[PDB]
Amino acid sequence: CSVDIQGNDQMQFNTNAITVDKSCKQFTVNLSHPGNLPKNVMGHNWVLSTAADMQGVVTDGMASGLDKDYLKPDDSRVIAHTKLIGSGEKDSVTFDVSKLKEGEQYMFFCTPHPFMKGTLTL
Ligand SMILES: [Cu+2]
C-alpha cells in the first residue's frame, strides 16, 4: 500500500502512473530527491488532485511561494501532498484511500515543475 518515488536534478519523476489497490485503507508515497541541487534551486514536491483541479493548484501554489512549499495553505483541492524537498532529502505522505473515487481521473505532479506529472488510479 505504498510507492517510492524519486524526483531528480533533471526534473523527472521515476514514474508517470501510480496504481492504488482499492483494498488498501491507507496509501503511502515515499518521495526522495537524488542529485546535488538544493531545495531553493531544484525543489520537488508530490501533489495529488483531480485532473481538472491541477492547474488551479499549480498556479495558486506558485503564488504561495517556496516557504509554503509552493502550495496554497489548506487547499481543499489537494487530496494529499508531501513537503517541498531538496536533494538528499526525503518526505512521506499517507492518505485515506477513501478520499479517492473509483473511475475518476487523478493527476499527481510537482507544482514548481508541473511537467513532472502522472496519473493516479484506484
Ligand atoms: Cu519539481
From Swiss-Prot:
Plastocyanin-like domain residues: 1-122
One Gene Ontology term of the molecular function aspect: electron transfer activity
Keyword set, alphabetical order: Copper, Disulfide bond, Electron transport, Metal-binding, Periplasm, Signal, Transport
Disulfide-bond pairs as recorded: 1-24
Subcellular location(s) of the protein: Periplasm
Recorded GO CC terms: periplasmic space; plasma membrane
Stated role: Transfers electrons from cytochrome c551 to cytochrome oxidase.
Protein name per its UniProtKB record: Azurin
Source organism: Pseudomonas aeruginosa (strain ATCC 15692 / DSM 22644 / CIP 104116 / JCM 14847 / LMG 12228 / 1C / PRS 101 / PAO1)
Full-length numbering of the shown residues: 23 to 147 of 148
